[PDB]
Amino acid sequence: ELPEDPKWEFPRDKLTLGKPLQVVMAEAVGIDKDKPKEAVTVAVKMLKDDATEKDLSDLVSEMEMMKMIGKHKNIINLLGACTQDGPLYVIVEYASKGNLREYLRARRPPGMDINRVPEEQMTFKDLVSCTYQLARGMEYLASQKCIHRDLAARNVLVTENNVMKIADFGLARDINNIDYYKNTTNGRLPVKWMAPEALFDRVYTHQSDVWSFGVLMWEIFTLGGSPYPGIPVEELFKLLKEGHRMDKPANCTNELYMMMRDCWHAVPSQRPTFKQLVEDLDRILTLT
Amino acid sequence: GVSEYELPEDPKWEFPRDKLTLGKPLQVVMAEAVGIDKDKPKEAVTVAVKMLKDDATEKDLSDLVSEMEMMKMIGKHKNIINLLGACTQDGPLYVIVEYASKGNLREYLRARRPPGMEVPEEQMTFKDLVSCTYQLARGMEYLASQKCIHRDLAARNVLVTENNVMKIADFGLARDINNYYKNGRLPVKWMAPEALFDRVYTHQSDVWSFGVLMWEIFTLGGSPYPGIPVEELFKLLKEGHRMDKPANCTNELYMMMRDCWHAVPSQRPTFKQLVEDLDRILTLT
Amino acid sequence: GVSEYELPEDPKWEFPRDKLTLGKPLQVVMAEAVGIDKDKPKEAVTVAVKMLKDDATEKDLSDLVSEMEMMKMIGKHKNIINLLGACTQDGPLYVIVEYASKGNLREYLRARRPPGDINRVPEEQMTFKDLVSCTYQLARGMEYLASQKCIHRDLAARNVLVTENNVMKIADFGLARDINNYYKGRLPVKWMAPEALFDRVYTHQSDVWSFGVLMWEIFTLGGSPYPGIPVEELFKLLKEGHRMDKPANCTNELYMMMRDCWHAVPSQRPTFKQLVEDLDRILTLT
Amino acid sequence: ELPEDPKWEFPRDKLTLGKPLQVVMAEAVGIDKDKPKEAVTVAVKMLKDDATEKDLSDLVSEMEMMKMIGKHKNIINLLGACTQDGPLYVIVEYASKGNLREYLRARRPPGVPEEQMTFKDLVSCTYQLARGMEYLASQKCIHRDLAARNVLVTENNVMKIADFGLARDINNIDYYKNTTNGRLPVKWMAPEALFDRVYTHQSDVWSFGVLMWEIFTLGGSPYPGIPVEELFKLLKEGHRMDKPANCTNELYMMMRDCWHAVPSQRPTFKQLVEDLDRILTLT
C-alpha cells in the first residue's frame, strides 16, 4: 500500500533490531554508503501490535516530513526506512542521552527525581547554549516552511556532546504556499505548549511554533519543570483568555525571561521570529 | 470545541472534591470516596479515578467527557464497570468509576499461564475461561440492548474483580447509536472489516471484536495475529485469513469465534445468540 | 562442610526431576509437579520450589539443606506449610513445598485493610473475627511445632503464607532448629526475645515472644513493629521495659495476651498450649 | 553503643535522605569541609527494619574497613557517618552509572539498552579494576567479594570497587581464615578459600579472574548452566571457564593465570596492572 522510494529504502537483512528505548535500538550495517561494512547504532520507529489506522498514517506522514525537511545539525536526522514487504520501520539517528526533559532533571544542582549525573550539573551557560541550539534548529525548520506543532523538552533529544536535536515530527506540517495551517477543532497538541491562535482560532503559523519555543525555554531554565505548575489544563483555557503567563523561573536572568514573554505575545507577528531569536541568543551566549 | 467550552452541571452525578482523596496511580489513580454511596454517607469506599495528564491535548479532554457521558446513559450491570460520579465543576475533570481488584484481563491471564509457556499465578481451569467468555457476552448483550457500541473491546479493556467477575471497561471510544456510526483510532487487530473498508460500525462490528476477545481468552492473553504486522493484516483478512484455533480450545468454541469473524456482519451471530450458546456450553462444562 | 560434601539419598522424599517443570519466581519459584501425590500419578499439581541462586554462598546451601531436613522432622499439620518432596540427587537441590496462592500474611493483611500499599482487595476486607481466627490458627501451628521440640526462631507475618482458602500456614524454616534433648545472630531484631541476644539462648518461650510480635502485626493489619524506632535503639528500650502500644481497634484482652508474650522472663510468658486454649475461647466468644 | 569518631562523624541535620537505589541517594551539605555550604549528592547505607544483629555488626565493620583503606580513584570512598543518637548511616560516594554487571548487560549488541562497549573500553575497565585491587592489596586488605555486581561505574566510565562488607585486614598475618560455610558467593571463590578456608591477596586475584570473565562476556553469569552444588566437584577436578566469545587469547590466558590452582603461581595485582597497561596501549 506504500510505493517504494529507492532513495531512502534500507534492506531489512542489514537491520538487526534491539530492545525498545514504539522506538527500539538497532544495528544497521552500512546505512551510510561511505562505510559499507560499518555497523552503526540507530533508533527504529515502528508500530505497536495494537496500532490503529491513524498510527500507521502518522508514522508514514512522519517519515515523509523528515524526508522533505532536509538535514540540519540540530534536528534528529532520518537515515532510511524499510517500507516494502514487511512492517514499516522508520530509521533515525540514535541520541545516547535521551530526551531533554529527563536530561535536565538528571543533572539539576543539589539543594532545592530518578537517576542523577552530578558530574554534569547544568551551568547557566549550558542552558543558554541548549536554548540557542534549539532556536537554530527551529530557524532552519521554519526556513523549510514546516511547522512542528509539538515542540517541547520531551521532544528534544540530546546526543553525545550535549548536542540538541529536535525530534518527533509526527504532528509536523508543511505550510509552503499557504498563509497558515488550519488545526482540527479538538487537536492532538498538548495544550500547555499551544499558542492561543491554535487553541481558540485553530490557526497555526511559524509564530505559533515561536510560542511553543517560549514554553520550551521555560522548561530549560526550570531544568525540566512542568509548565503552568498546579494548573490543570481544563482551567488553563480561561486563564489564557485572560492573558495568564508563567512567571520567571528561579535562577534565570530578567533578559531571558523577557525573551520568553516576547515569545508569548498575544499577537503572533509581534513575537520574535526564530531568526531574531537566534541572533539575540547568540549575543547572550557570547556574553555570559 | 474543548478550549472555549464549559462543562455544565449535572446534579445526580456530581461528587464533592473535598470528599475525594486521590491515591496511587493504577491516567487512572486509586482513590477513596466518602459517601459516594449516599446510603452509607460516612463510608469511605475505594474507587478508581480517571483524569487528564499534564500533557493533555484538547482531544483528550473531549474523549474523557465523552467517556463519562457514555457511562451515564449505559445503566448498571454486573459485567460492566459502572460510573460512581464525577467532579466536573470548578477544578480538573474527575470521572469516578468502580475499582476492580484484579486488574485487566490480558495481564490477569498471562500471569496464570502454565510453567514454560511464553509474578506468576495459579492456572485457570477451562470452566473458568468459559465462564469469563459467558459473562463478557452477557455484558455486551446488555450494552447492545442499550444501543451502545463499545468499539474497543479487547482483553486489555476488561477488568477482573471479586470471584473471577468480568467487567467490561474503557468506554473512551464507545458511541450511542440510538435513533450505524460513520482514519480510525481503533486497534486494527480487533477491528471488523466493514469498520475500515466501509467506515461503518454496528453491534455486529462489536461481535467481530468479541471473537478476537475470545481468542485472547483461550490463548491466555496471547497477541492476536502473532507475527503479522498491522500493515499486512488488511490484505490477509481480505483473502479470508483468520486466526488458527487456540491450543486446548474446543472446536465448538473455535467455530463460535469463526462465526464472529464472518465477513458479512449480518451473517455473524448476535450477542443474544452468543449468550444462549455460551450459557449451554458453560452448563455442559 | 558444604563444599567437600554430598547429600545422602532419601527415597521416601526424593522426587524425579524429569517430572518437575519450573516456572517463574514468586529463590522460590512456582512449578508443576506431576505425580507429587502418588495417589494421583497422572495429576500435575502446582507447587513452590525453593532453590539456590547463581550467586549462592556455602551458607545458603547448608541453610537450604537444614531447612529441608527440619521440615522432614516436623511432620504434617494444617497450619504449617507442607513439604512435598525434593530433588537432591544429581543436580541442584530443589525443596518442593505446598503452594500458597494468597502470598505472605503481611501483604495479605495490607491488601485488605479497610478504607481510612499496592493492590487492594476490598471484597476481602479483614473483620475483627478474621484476625482472631488467624491468630488462633497460628497458635495451633506453633503449639504443634513446640510439641515436636522444634523452635522456629523466625516467626513473623512475612513468614506466614495464606492459601486460597485463607488457611494460615507457618513457613520459612530456614532458621528453625531441633532442640529435642535450648539452642545456644541472624534473627530479625524486632521479633527477637531479649534472652536470644542478651543470653544467647533460644527456647519455645523465645518463639512465644515472637508470636506476640506476630499478633501485633496481625492486629495492625501488617504494620511494622516498633515504628519509628531503629533496630540499633531497640536494645536499650526493651531493657527499660519498653513495649509496643496497643493496635487500634484491638481488644484489651488480646493486647494483654501480647504483653504476656513479651514478659522479660521466659518462664513468665504463656506456653503455646495456653495461648491456643485462650484464643480458642476468645474466638468462640467473637 | 558505638564510641564516637569525630574524624568521620557527620551531623544528621546536614543530611537529607532521598529515594533508594539498603542504600539510598542523599544530599549532604558540606560533606566536603573545603565546601562549607556546598551540598553534594551521595549514597547512604543503612539497616533495614528487619535487620539482624549480624547485619548491624557487618555495617559497622564495613564502615571501619573503609576508614582504613585510604583513598584511591578506583575505590568508592567513605565520606562520613552518622553514628550517634540515631540509626547508623554510612555515607559514601555516589556512583552515577550503577553497578558494572547491569551497566554491561545493557551495553549488549542488538539481536533500557545503551550504546556499546568497544573492546578498548572493556580492557580499560579491567585495567582500572586491577589498579584498584593493587592499591587495596598494598593496604593489606582482602576484599573477598569481588564481582561485577560489586563494581560501581561513575560519570566518565570510571570503575570504583565497592561493597566492603566482607573485606578484611590481613596486616601482620599470613592469611585470613574463613568460617567453614562462609557468606562468599561460591562462583567467585578461590579453591583455597572454598576447600581449605584460607584467604590471601592471591585469593582476590582468583576472583579478579572471574570478574574479567564477567567483563568480557559483557555481564555474563560465571560457570553458565552449572549449579553451585555441582561446581564443588568440578573445581576439585580442575574445571575452568572457556574463553568468552570476542576475547583475545592473550586476555583469556590472563584469566587462566588468575585461576592457577597454586596461589603464588597466579599473577599479583602489581603484575596484572603492568600487563594490562601494555595490552591497553596496544589497543
Ligand SMILES: Nc1ncnc2c1ncn2[C@@H]1O[C@H](COP(=O)(O)OP(=O)(O)CP(=O)(O)O)[C@@H](O)[C@H]1O
Ligand atoms: N510456598 C509458597 N507459596 C507461595 N508463595 C510463597 C511460598 N514461599 C514463599 N512465597 C512468597 O514468595 C516470596 C519470595 O520468596 P523468598 O523466600 O525469596 O523471600 P524471603 O522470604 O527470603 C523474603 P522476605 O521474607 O524478606 O520478604 C516470599 O516473600 C513469599 O511471599
